[PDB]
Design a protein around this ligand. Structure first.
Ligand SMILES: OC[C@H]1O[C@@H](O)[C@H](O)[C@@H](O)[C@@H]1O
Length: 229
């Protein structure tokens, strides 16, 4: 309890979830797009496109009571932030480290791609950081067929171990998606949600994602499961 997050594009779609066991929200942007009473909004520095406004964006979100900031979104993937580990280590020290006295700082969020993507990219990043990146938690993503639940638990375990190796005590799984039809998607949530709630190495997580769990303004059967399990 208190771990479950709302990852959104349309802030209006959050209403369907009002009353459920949610503590936090993010929107892959530096600004929320509106106001949600009773939930922590966590601003994100997505990539180099956000460098210009980030100081302003980070001051605003902390003034509104966020305790956490998130760095770049899938820098290992060419259609997302598309940064080398070297460039990301230099950017993290310039734009993330300055706010450490006033917020806990999240790593760039890697995919579950095969090394040298994914957790391979995150090794590369910690190597170039070389102890000079201030990181409170690792941010990681997993997307795959609902039948590969065992691969999803191996991936989250290996992320927890990698952080501990570099004295980062927890992970946030800021996207996961057990893919398939609605029955397969609910079966995946029925397994992983209790396992993530019991896992001491996972501080926070968000299924991917609010706008796909709502039809009109009604929860799908997947959204209903994300609310009630
Ligand atoms: O569709 C959900 C979100 O997915 C992410 O992969 C993109 O980086 C965001 O900018 C987009 O809003």
């Amino acid at each position: 309890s208190g771990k479950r997050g709302l990852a959104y594009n349309n802030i209006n779609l959050l209403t369907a979830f009002e009353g459920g066991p949610f503590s936090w929200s993010y929107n892959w942007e530096p600004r929320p797009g509106g106001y949600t009473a009773g939930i922590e909004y966590v601003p994100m520095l997505w990539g180099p496109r956000g460098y210009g406004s980030w100081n302003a964006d980070a001051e605003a979100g902390i003034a509104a009571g966020s305790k956490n900031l998130l760095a770049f979104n899938e820098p290992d993937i060419a259609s997302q932030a598309n940064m080398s580990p070297e460039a990301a280590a230099a950017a993290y020290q310039k734009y993330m480290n300055p706010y450490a006295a006033r917020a806990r700082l999240g790593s760039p969020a890697v995919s579950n791609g095969a090394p040298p993507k994914g957790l391979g990219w995150m090794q590369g990043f910690l190597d170039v950081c070389a102890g000079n990146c201030k990181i409170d938690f690792l941010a990681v993503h997993w997307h795959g067929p609902s039948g590969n639940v065992d691969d999803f638990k191996r991936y989250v375990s290996e992320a927890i171990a990698l952080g501990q190796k570099y004295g980062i005590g927890t992970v946030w799984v800021t996207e996961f998606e057990g893919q398939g039809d609605e029955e397969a998607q609910v079966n995946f949530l029925k397994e992983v949600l209790p396992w993530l709630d019991s896992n001491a190495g996972v501080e926070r997580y968000a299924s991917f994602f609010v706008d796909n769990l709502v039809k009109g303004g009604a929860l799908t059967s997947v959204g209903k499961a994300y609310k009630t399990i």
